[PDB]
């Protein structure tokens, strides 16, 4: 339950907005004519419980949740890193709707080496 | 028997149900750019008689470059 | 975005000195925040004094230092480096007065302090000082003045500034404040600094949880409001 | 660094 | 050139001292300044836009004097500007005490540039990442020089460093007639900045100095406001 | 063995576009955000013939852009889109879609079913203050 | 790879940095000095000739070292200033110490040692500047000296450095003239060589720069011909060019 | 110097007094004075003297004559900058006087010389006058290249705000005559408007009127209300802005009679601006079709008299418009005059089978021929 995460009333309230709304009452977004908002970037000190809030949101909506440890997706061999991201979104098309929770995203988003542009390619794929 | 080949979507050949749904009037402005693209990737398929009437083989590639967004 | 970084003297390809950049991110490692608000004739600096022990000699846990009889400074960032920056400043002013016949205007004291920090950014000898300084002083012909010198040596004249972990909201709060122009009375300024620090953190600000400095045009001397006064001020803020 | 890799085929 | 980018004392295989170039990137990504030499004098402009209202716009001035007849405008790392100016005023001064005449703007840049080149000959000192525009009126002919972090000093008639510099130059070559006068020149200089300054040209947002026959002087907020009002 | 396999891709790209096996009626559209890093062989009139450029919308394309994103949005009659299309800031196309998609999201939060002029200004200051971080010392 | 420091010897014995440096001269402007009795000339190219660029010096590539010594430059701008600064200071010291003009060659050796000395002690970047010297002395009269970034110098009768050095040097050979090198012939060839060496045709007068050194009544006037005379010079070559087409 | 200033003033007051003979005489009298003054000062002086002279409404026929005499006069003294100046104004005068072929020819001469010469500031001005003259001549595909010539040369010059307005207004007319894209037609008008607005020029109103027209023609007669009040439109708010306002409601309410009331209520506001007439007339001539079809949709035979009552148009007006609509294959029907009825009906297909047979017959007709040739071999 949202209640189980503690002291994030405002933050939990916000993340409800962007994530929950387009999935449950799309009419509101299509009534005003704006495409449903998609995506929430939760930044904070490690262990604060970013994942849980992102996990409760799945539990309330009863929508499938896919968790990707973003740092892991950046494997050494070339083009594997873009591919894991590609399979994630391609997996989503098959199973809808799924909160794609990417863990620390600093790795893939945020220069002159073969490997220094593989990070560049993976961002472009994302 | 010679069964019909199968190359419908091997590399994501846009199916009749994957049309992006963005009409030309929906794109805003880009008056000059749209015509240049509309002159190498759209027009030749339809009006190929016009291209061959002037003796120029229709341009085959377009490279849209510019600031992101 | 790590860049060549590992050396302060080697430019990143985009023209960004990453090592200098990391300096500021070291600035908030102190875990505290200081706010300076310039009023009609006063400047008030409020800091966070979070003494995490019953054994700490509370008298010496201060972030506020007195650079000179008319200029007071607060450090936000690494205590060790902030101490050196304080000590280097004091000489810089004393050399200023001894060299030109008058007290160094608060304007330059950040300039010379900034200039010292800037050469540590070129000549890869000294690791940069990881602390921002705020100089407050009643300057003749220019009223109370406030300045904030950063690790890279950038100083500016601030109607109000705050450096620390919650800088973005502290400045946004102040930015909201200064705009609805009002008669910034000494009581108003001291109140404004306390509210700014309070709102960002969401704390009650017990009497001893902060160290508010005050400098006024009427009595151009650096003073640190004694714990009795902050309570009086704090109760005034409530009502 | 970035390493391209070949591959065999266990029949 | 991939591994030779870092050290400023190691030629790349193509004979390219990359580090100087990357420093020039820091200039090409700085506050826009514009310079125009009108047959009556030299006009310089730069945008002094702060990040919030909390700043005191009059605190730090970019368009600055060196002597009574020379001034500077910079587009790059600020603090690296100040170290440049001081060695500029001292150098402008060290010329006066020795020769007793105001330093010709050609010499000052020849020695304000030679100051720059000093830091680009050894490892352990970063290049001065601030291109400089120097205006002066000496020997009855307006002067506008640009000294770079690379140590090369030009003789620009009218240019603009900083963000969106390519566009600024294109506006010049368009609205720059070698036969203007200082009065018209100020309007052109402001307009060149207007092509990039993202906002209203408030009198505490653009700082302009005029290098005329009498000497250089950082325009007071009002007079610019008189100028800015006219242009708008 | 890595920059070599990125180069084996560009060359395989070059060889099919204009190579010994000429194809009939296969047009190639390519989009890039840099336009100079591209290999000179892939910009030579024959493979990528028309190098269309998409420059940041001027004070005019911004108007047309605003009129198409909003012409579906419910705008309260007091929203003069010409008040925001004149501001000199060099907003890009996503930013105009942004300044509009989030503009309505501000209205949606307050449960109001009509985007008001107040939000657009609240929206208009969020999609353009992109410095934020900076560091003040690069200027 | 052994190109990290200017003092590291490659296994074959090549100071790579010096090869990298002197090879760097290629990116620079073209300067040439032709064979000439009773004179010798330098012709440079103003690579950057944009419009908004106010011309204040008129001699961006030709410097006067001593009262009878002129040297061009082809390389780094910053290093060019410091070498031209060190060159003059060396020449004037010789005049002060011996009350006699520095006899050309000892000027090049003085600078060449300074340039070479950088190629020996570590931590100093090899001067990436070659520079033509012309002048006169009481010892051998008009001389031409070609300095290199690697310090090695050498007397020359006609040479070009920088952009398209190969094209200029060969042609200066192809029509190379020995003995019969009067100044007028030198001028015609000098602009003649720049015509093809300089990619942009028409050798527009302002886009070229000729400085000549002559011994007049024992005064050694070092001249930097103004645009007007270049226009007629370009015209003089221009008129001669048309007459050659008659072959067809 | 002192002699230069006064003669500027005398013409202005004289222009106010309209002593064209005195002004024209002054212009010819100031001719020796023009020699006594600088080429730059005289140019703008003669310009202002000529502009002021041509400004006066005393159209006595010497305007073309004087400009020709001014054109020759510059020819003798060799004041090429001025002669390109009088010519530039002369092309402008011709266009306003309806004398087009002459306007194009002289301008075509001006473009011949200007192209190689300097003063690209005049190339855009003259290149525009050809662009707008080519529109009146009805040569639209040649105006599109003409204007893009001014906008392929405007990008390389200063383009003052006044000129930047003209290169727009003429660039919204040419997107309007093509009747293909309006949103682009409207965009240029709005940009054209703001340019004139700033300079406080009288033609900024023509900018606004066309903007409303672009909105009206785009099937959006509701947006007209907004702009007609707007923020920069209130200052201009008058009859002209009201003229388009009444038409807009006419299309929104779709009342051919109402539209006709507007076209008659306001004659010098819609019928005197040919861009507003040609385009608006096409509207009413189209609003009638879309309304005729809606009325006839139910009926299968309706007295031509009755359709007149619904559309609120005279039987003759609907008698014709029906005739052209049937003729042009708009709707499938027929007008019988002896019963005063329009016989609506459905067109049956072209029964492809018979078309494949007729084509096949010719096919086999050709084969039977080739059989002949085999028969000749015997
Ligand atoms: N603020 C919190 N509220 C509730 N549970 C929390 C909180 N912080 C951590 N937890 C606990 O830790 C886990 C969630 O931490 P996690 O979301 O992975 O942290 P982060 O993503 O910030 O690194 C759960 O077991 C949860 O019960």
Which of H171, H178, H183 should one mutate to test binding to chain B, selecting the residue with the greatest count of B CBs within 10 A?
H183
Measured between beta carbons, which residues in chain F are less than 8 angstroms from residue E76? Answer: 138-139
The Cβ of residue H109 has, within 10 Å, a number of other Cβ atoms equal to: 13
- List the residue whose alpha carbon is closest to atom 25 of ligand 1: A52
Instruction: Say if A10 is an interface residue toward chain C (CB within 8 Å).
Output: no
| Ramachandran quadrant class, G75 (left: phi over 0; alpha: psi -120 to 50; beta: rest) | left
Instruction: Say if F95 is an interface residue toward chain B (CB within 8 Å).
Output: yes
Cis peptide before G125 (omega within 30 of 0): no
* CATH code where residue C117 lies: 3.60.20.10
Closest CA to C182 of C37, C40, C36, C43: C40
Q: How far apart are CA F9 and CA D1, in angstroms?
A: 19
Beta bridge mates, E141 = E138
Ligand 1 atom showing the smallest separation from residue A46 Cα: 23
Q: How far apart are CA H362 and CA H355, in angstroms?
A: 11
CB contact under 8 A, H190 and F63: yes
Q: How far apart are CA E153 and CA G49, in angstroms?
A: 15
CB contact under 8 A, C150 and F138: no
Instruction: Say if E187 is an interface residue toward chain H (CB within 8 Å).
Output: no
Please tell me the class of the E2-231 domain. Answer: alpha beta
Q: How far apart are CA H157 and CA H122, in angstroms?
A: 10
Resolution, angstroms, 1 dp: 3.5
G48: closest chain E residue by CA: E154
Q: How far apart are CA E60 and CA C154, in angstroms?
A: 10
Point out the annotated binding site of A for ATP: 44-51
Q: How far apart are CA C140 and CA C158, in angstroms?
A: 17
C-alpha R_g of chain A: 16
Ligand 1 atom showing the smallest separation from residue A103 Cα: 21
Q: How many residues does chain D have?
A: 11
- Spatial contact of E39 and E144, defined as CB atoms under 8 Å apart: no
Domain ranges in chain E are 2-231
A49 Cβ below 6 A of ligand 1: yes
Test site for ligand 1: of A11, A15, A52, A71, most ligand atoms within 8 A of the Cβ: A52
DSSP conformation class of G53: B
CB contact under 8 A, G78 and E122: no
Burial class of residue F80 in the structure, from the number of CB atoms within 10 Å of its CB (0-12 exposed, 13-18 middle, 19+ buried): middle
Given the DSSP bridges, would you call strands B61-65 and F28-32 parallel, antiparallel or unpaired?
parallel
Domain ranges in chain G are 1-246
DSSP string, E48-100: ---SSTTB-TTSS-SSEESSTTEEEEEEE-HHHHHHHHHHHHHHHHHHHHHH-
Measured between beta carbons, which residues in chain F are less than 8 angstroms from residue E196? Answer: 90
Whether chains G and H touch (3+ CB pairs under 8 A) is answered by no
Burial class of residue G166 in the structure, from the number of CB atoms within 10 Å of its CB (0-12 exposed, 13-18 middle, 19+ buried): exposed
Whether chains C and B touch (3+ CB pairs under 8 A) is answered by no
- Spatial contact of C114 and E80, defined as CB atoms under 8 Å apart: no
A16 Cβ below 6 A of ligand 1: no
Q: Three-state SS for G146? A: strand
Backbone angles phi, psi at C235, to 5 degrees: -65, -35
Q: How far apart are CA G227 and CA C15, in angstroms?
A: 41
CB contact under 8 A, E11 and G125: yes
Q: How far apart are CA C133 and CA C74, in angstroms?
A: 6
Query: CATH assignment of G1-246, given 3.30.479.30, 3.50.50.60, 3.40.190.10, 3.60.20.10?
Result: 3.60.20.10
A54 Cβ below 6 A of ligand 1: no
Which of F72, F103, F105, F127 should one mutate to test binding to chain A, selecting the residue with the greatest count of A CBs within 10 A?
F105
Q: How was this structure determined?
A: cryo-EM
* Coarse DSSP helix, strand, coil percentages of chain C, rounded to the nearest 5 percent: 40, 25, 35
Ligand 1 atom showing the smallest separation from residue A52 Cα: 17
Backbone angles phi, psi at H204, to 5 degrees: -60, -30
The dihedral built from the CA positions of residue C201, C204, C208 and C212, taken in this order, carries a sign that is positive
Beta bridge mates, C215 = C43
Chain F nearest-CA distance from C220, in A, is 30
- Spatial contact of E136 and E215, defined as CB atoms under 8 Å apart: no
Ligand 1 atom showing the smallest separation from residue A53 Cα: 17
Instruction: Name the neighbours of F, counting chains with at least 3 Cβ pairs within 8 A.
Output: A, B, C, D, E, H
C-alpha R_g of chain F: 22
- List the residue whose alpha carbon is closest to atom 2 of ligand 1: A49
Q: Which residue has the tokens 């003009």?
A: G101
Chain C nearest-CA distance from A11, in A, is 15
Instruction: Name the neighbours of E, counting chains with at least 3 Cβ pairs within 8 A.
Output: A, C, F, G, H
Nearest to E30 among F89, F90, F138 (CB): F138
Q: How far apart are CA C233 and CA H73, in angstroms?
A: 88
Backbone angles phi, psi at H9, to 5 degrees: -70, -40
The dihedral built from the CA positions of residue B64, B69, C5 and C8, taken in this order, carries a sign that is positive
> How far does residue E178's CA lie from ligand 1's centre (Å)?
68
Closest CA to E41 of E75, E73, E70, E64: E70
What are the CA-CA distances from residue C196 to residues C44, C48, C215, H102, H120 (Å)?
Answer: 12, 12, 18, 76, 59
What are the CA-CA distances from residue B16 to residues B6, B8, B9, B25 (Å)?
Answer: 16, 11, 11, 21
CB contact under 8 A, A78 and D2: yes
- List the residue whose alpha carbon is closest to atom 4 of ligand 1: A5
Q: How many domains does chain C have?
A: 1
What are the CA-CA distances from residue F9 to residues A118, F4, F16, G27 (Å)?
Answer: 15, 9, 11, 32
Whether chains A and D touch (3+ CB pairs under 8 A) is answered by yes
Test site for ligand 1: of A41, A49, A65, most ligand atoms within 8 A of the Cβ: A49
- List the residue whose alpha carbon is closest to atom 14 of ligand 1: A49
Greatest CA span in chain E, whole angstroms?
A: 54
Q: Three-state SS for G212? A: strand
Q: How far apart are CA H205 and CA H209, in angstroms?
A: 6
Beta bridge mates, B62 = F29, F50
Beta bridge mates, E71 = E65, E135
Q: Please, which residues have CB within 8 angstroms of residue C173's CB and are 6 or more apart in sequence?
A: C195, C196, C199, C200
Q: Three-state SS for A1? A: coil
Closest CA to H283 of H225, H204, H191, H212: H212
Instruction: Say if H158 is an interface residue toward chain E (CB within 8 Å).
Output: yes
DSSP string, C21-77: HHHHHHHGGG--EEEEEE-SSEEEEEEE-----SSS-GGG---EEEEETTEEEEEEE
Measured between beta carbons, which residues in chain F are less than 8 angstroms from residue H161? Answer: none
Q: How far apart are CA A16 and CA A14, in angstroms?
A: 5
Chain A nearest-CA distance from F93, in A, is 16
Q: Please, which residues have CB within 8 angstroms of residue E150's CB and are 6 or more apart in sequence?
A: E20, E23, E24, E116, E120, E127, G77, G78
Chain A nearest-CA distance from C201, in A, is 14
> How far does residue A55's CA lie from ligand 1's centre (Å)?
10
Given the DSSP bridges, would you call strands G31-33 and G159-161 parallel, antiparallel or unpaired?
antiparallel
Q: Which residue has the tokens 């720049």?
A: G194
Structure tokens at G207: 């886009």
Instruction: Say if C60 is an interface residue toward chain A (CB within 8 Å).
Output: no
Q: Which helix (H) or strand (E) holds E43?
A: strand E41-47
Q: How far apart are CA F8 and CA G34, in angstroms?
A: 49
A48 Cβ below 6 A of ligand 1: yes
B27: closest chain H residue by CA: H183
Q: Please, which residues have CB within 8 angstroms of residue H174's CB and are 6 or more apart in sequence?
A: H131, H135, H140, H143, H144, H147
| Ramachandran quadrant class, H200 (left: phi over 0; alpha: psi -120 to 50; beta: rest) | left
Chain F nearest-CA distance from D11, in A, is 27
CB contact under 8 A, F137 and C20: yes
Chain E nearest-CA distance from G157, in A, is 27
Q: Please, which residues have CB within 8 angstroms of residue C21's CB and are 6 or more apart in sequence?
A: F135
Given the DSSP bridges, would you call strands A98-102 and A64-68 parallel, antiparallel or unpaired?
parallel
DSSP string, F46-110: TSS-B--B-PPP-TTHHHHHHHHHHTTS-B-TT--GGGTSSS-----HHHHHHHHHHHHHHHHHT
Terminal C-alpha separation, chain A: 30
Q: Which residue has the tokens 């060290």?
A: E94
Closest CA to G50 of E172, E180, E37, E185: E172
Instruction: Say if A111 is an interface residue toward chain D (CB within 8 Å).
Output: no
Instruction: Say if E219 is an interface residue toward chain C (CB within 8 Å).
Output: no
- List the residue whose alpha carbon is closest to atom 12 of ligand 1: A49
A67 Cβ below 6 A of ligand 1: no
> How far does residue A7's CA lie from ligand 1's centre (Å)?
12
C-alpha R_g of chain C: 18
Whether chains D and C touch (3+ CB pairs under 8 A) is answered by no
Domains for chain H: give ranges and CATH numbers. Answer: 1-343 (1.25.40.570)
Q: Three-state SS for A106? A: coil
DSSP conformation class of B4: P
> How far does residue H210's CA lie from ligand 1's centre (Å)?
62
Sheet arrangement for strand C131-139: C64-68, C71-77, C131-139, C143-149
Backbone angles phi, psi at C210, to 5 degrees: -145, 165
């Amino acid at each position: 339950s949202y209640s189980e995460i503690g002291g994030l009333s405002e933050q939990i309230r916000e993340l409800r907005e962007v994530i929950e709304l387009p999935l449950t009452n799309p009419e509101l977004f299509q009534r005003v004519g704006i495409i449903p908002p998609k995506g929430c970037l939760l930044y904070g000190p490690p262990g604060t419980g970013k994942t849980l809030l992102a996990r409760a949101v799945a539990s309330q909506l009863d929508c499938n949740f896919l968790k990707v440890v973003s740092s892991s997706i950046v494997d050494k061999y070339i083009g594997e890193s873009a591919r894991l991201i590609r399979e994630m979104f391609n997996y989503a098309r098959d199973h809808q709707p799924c909160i794609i929770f990417m863990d620390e995203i600093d790795a893939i988003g945020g220069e002159g080496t073969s490997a220094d542009r593989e990070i560049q390619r993976t961002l472009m794929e994302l | 028997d010679v069964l019909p080949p199968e190359a419908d979507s091997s590399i994501m050949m846009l199916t009749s149900d994957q049309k992006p749904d963005v009409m030309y009037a929906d794109i805003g402005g880009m008056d000059i750019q749209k015509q240049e693209v509309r002159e190498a990737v759209e027009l030749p398929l339809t009006h190929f008689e016009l291209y061959k009437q002037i003796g120029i083989d229709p341009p085959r590639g377009v490279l849209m470059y510019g600031p992101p967004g | 975005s790590a860049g060549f970084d590992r050396h302060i003297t080697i430019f990143s390809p985009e023209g960004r000195l990453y090592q200098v950049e990391y300096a500021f991110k070291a600035i908030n490692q102190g875990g505290l925040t200081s706010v300076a608000v310039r009023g009609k004739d006063c400047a008030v600096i409020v800091t966070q004094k979070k003494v995490p022990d019953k054994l700490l000699d509370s008298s010496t846990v201060t972030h506020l230092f007195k650079i000179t009889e008319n200029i007071g400074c607060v450090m936000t960032g690494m205590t060790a480096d902030s101490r050196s920056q304080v000590q280097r400043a004091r000489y810089e002013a004393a050399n200023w007065k001894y060299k030109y016949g008058y007290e160094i205007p608060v304007d330059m004291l950040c300039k010379r302090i900034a200039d010292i920090s800037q050469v540590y950014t070129q000549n890869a000898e000294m690791r940069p000082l990881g602390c921002c300084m705020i100089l407050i002083g009643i300057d003749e012909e220019q009223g109370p003045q406030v300045y904030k010198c950063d690790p890279a040596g950038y100083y500016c004249g601030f109607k109000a500034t705050a450096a620390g972990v919650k800088q973005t909201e502290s400045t946004s709060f102040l930015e909201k404040k200064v705009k609805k122009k009002f008669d910034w009375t000494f009581e108003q300024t001291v109140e404004t600094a306390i509210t700014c620090l309070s709102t960002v953190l969401s704390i009650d600000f017990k009497p001893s949880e902060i160290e508010v400095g005050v400098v006024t045009v009427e009595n151009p001397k650096f003073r640190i409001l004694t714990e009795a006064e902050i309570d009086a001020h704090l109760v005034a803020l409530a009502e | 660094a970035x390493x391209x890799x070949x591959x065999x085929x266990x029949x | 050139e991939r591994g030779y980018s870092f050290s400023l004392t190691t030629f790349s295989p193509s004979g390219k001292l990359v580090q100087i170039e990357y420093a020039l990137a820091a200039v090409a990504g700085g506050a826009p300044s514009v310079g125009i030499k009108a047959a009556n004098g030299v006009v310089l402009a730069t945008e002094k836009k702060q990040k919030s209202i909390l700043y005191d716009e009059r605190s730090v001035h970019k368009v600055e004097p060196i002597t009574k007849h020379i001034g500077l405008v910079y587009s790059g790392m600020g603090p690296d500007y100040r170290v440049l100016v001081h060695r500029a005023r001292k150098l402008a001064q060290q010329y006066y005490l020795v020769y007793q005449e105001p330093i010709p703007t050609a010499q000052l840049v020849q020695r304000v540039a030679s100051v720059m080149q000093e830091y680009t000959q050894s490892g352990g000192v970063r290049p001065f990442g601030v291109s400089l525009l120097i205006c002066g009126w000496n020997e009855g002919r307006p002067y506008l020089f640009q000294s770079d972090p690379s140590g090369a000093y030009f003789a620009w008639k009218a240019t603009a460093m900083g963000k969106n510099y390519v566009n600024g130059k294109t506006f010049l070559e368009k609205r720059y007639n070698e036969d203007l006068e200082l009065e018209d020149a100020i309007h052109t200089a402001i307009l060149t900045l207007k092509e990039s300054f993202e906002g209203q040209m408030t009198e505490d947002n653009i700082e302009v100095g005029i290098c005329n026959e009498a000497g250089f002087r950082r325009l007071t907020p009002t007079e610019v406001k008189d100028y800015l009002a006219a242009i708008a | 063995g890595a920059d070599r396999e990125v180069q084996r891709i560009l060359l395989e790209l070059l060889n099919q576009m204009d190579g010994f096996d000429q194809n009939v009626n296969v047009k190639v559209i390519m989009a890039t955000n840099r336009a100079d890093t591209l290999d000179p062989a892939l910009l030579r009139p024959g493979r990528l013939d028309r190098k269309i450029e998409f420059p940041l919308p001027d004070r005019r394309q911004k108007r047309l852009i605003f009129s198409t994103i909003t012409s579906k949005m419910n705008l309260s009659e007091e929203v003069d889109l010409e008040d925001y299309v004149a501001r000199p800031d060099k907003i890009s196309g996503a930013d105009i879609n942004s300044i509009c998609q989030e503009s309505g999201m501000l209205a949606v939060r307050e449960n109001r079913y009509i985007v008001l002029a107040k939000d657009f200004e609240k929206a208009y200051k969020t999609v353009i203050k992109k410095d934020e971080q900076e560091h003040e010392f690069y200027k | 790879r052994y190109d990290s420091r200017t003092t590291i010897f490659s296994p074959e014995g090549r100071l790579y940095q010096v090869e990298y440096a002197m090879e760097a001269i290629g990116h620079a402007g073209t300067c040439l000095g032709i064979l000439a009795n009773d004179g010798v000339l330098l012709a440079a190219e103003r690579r950057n000739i944009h419009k908004l660029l106010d011309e204040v010096f008129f001699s961006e590539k030709i410097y006067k070292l001593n009262e009878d010594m002129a040297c061009s430059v082809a390389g780094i701008t910053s290093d060019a200033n410091v070498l031209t600064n060190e060159l003059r200071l060396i020449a004037q010291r010789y005049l002060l110490q011996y009350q006699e003009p520095i006899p050309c060659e000892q000027l090049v050796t003085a600078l060449c040692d300074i340039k070479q000395a950088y190629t020996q002690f570590g931590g100093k970047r090899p001067f990436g500047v070659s520079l033509l010297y012309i002048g006169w002395d009481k010892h051998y009269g008009f001389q031409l000296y070609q300095s290199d970034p690697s310090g090695n110098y050498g007397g020359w009768k006609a040479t070009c450095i920088g952009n398209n050095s190969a094209a200029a040097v060969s042609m200066l050979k192809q029509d190379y003239k020995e003995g019969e090198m009067t100044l007028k012939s030198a001028l015609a060839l000098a602009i003649k060589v720049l015509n093809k060496t300089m990619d942009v045709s028409k050798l527009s007068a302002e886009k070229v720069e000729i400085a000549t050194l002559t011994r007049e009544n024992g005064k050694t006037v070092i001249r930097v011909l103004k645009q007007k005379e270049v226009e007629q010079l370009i015209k003089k070559h221009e008129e001669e060019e048309a007459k050659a087409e008659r072959e067809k | 110097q002192v002699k230069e200033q006064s003669i500027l003033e005398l013409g202005s007051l004289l222009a106010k007094t309209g002593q064209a003979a005195e002004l024209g005489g002054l212009l010819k009298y100031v001719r020796p004075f023009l020699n006594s003054i600088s080429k730059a000062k005289a140019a703008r002086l003669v310009r202002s003297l000529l502009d002021l002279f041509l400004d006066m409404e005393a159209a006595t026929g010497q305007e073309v004559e004087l400009c020709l005499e001014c054109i020759e006069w510059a020819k003798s003294e060799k004041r090429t900058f001025l002669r390109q100046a009088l010519e530039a104004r002369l092309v402008s005068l011709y266009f306003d006087t309806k004398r087009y072929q002459e306007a194009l020819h002289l301008g075509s001469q001006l473009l011949r010389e200007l192209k190689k010469m300097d003063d690209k500031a005049l190339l855009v001005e003259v290149q525009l006058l050809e662009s707008k003259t080519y529109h009146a001549l009805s040569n639209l595909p040649k105006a599109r290249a003409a204007l893009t010539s001014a906008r392929t040369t405007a990008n390389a010059i200063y383009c003052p705000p006044k000129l930047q307005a003209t290169l727009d207004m003429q660039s919204g007319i040419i997107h309007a005559a093509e009747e293909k894209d309006w949103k682009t037609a409207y965009s240029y008008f709005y940009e054209a408007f703001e340019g004139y607005d700033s300079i406080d020029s009288p033609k900024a109103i023509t900018s606004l009127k066309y903007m409303l027209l672009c909105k009206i023609m785009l099937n959006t007669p509701e947006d007209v209300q907004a702009l007609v009040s707007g923020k920069l439109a209130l200052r201009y708010a008058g009859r002209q802005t009201e003229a388009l306002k009444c038409v807009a409601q006419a299309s929104k309410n779709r009342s051919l009679a109402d539209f006709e009331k507007a076209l008659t209520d306001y004659r010098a506001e819609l019928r005197d601006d040919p861009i507003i007439s040609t385009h608006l007339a096409k509207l009413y001539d189209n609003l009638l079709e879309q309304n005729l079809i809606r009325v006839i949709e139910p009926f299968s035979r309706v007295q031509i008299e009755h359709i007149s009552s619904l559309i609120k148009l005279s039987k003759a007006d609907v008698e014709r418009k029906l005739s052209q609509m049937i003729l042009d294959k708009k709707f499938h029907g027929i007008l019988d005059q002896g019963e005063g009825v329009l016989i609506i009906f459905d067109e049956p297909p072209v029964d492809k089978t018979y078309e494949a047979a007729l084509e096949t017959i010719q096919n086999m007709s050709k084969v039977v021929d080739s059989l002949y040739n085999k028969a000749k071999k015997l």
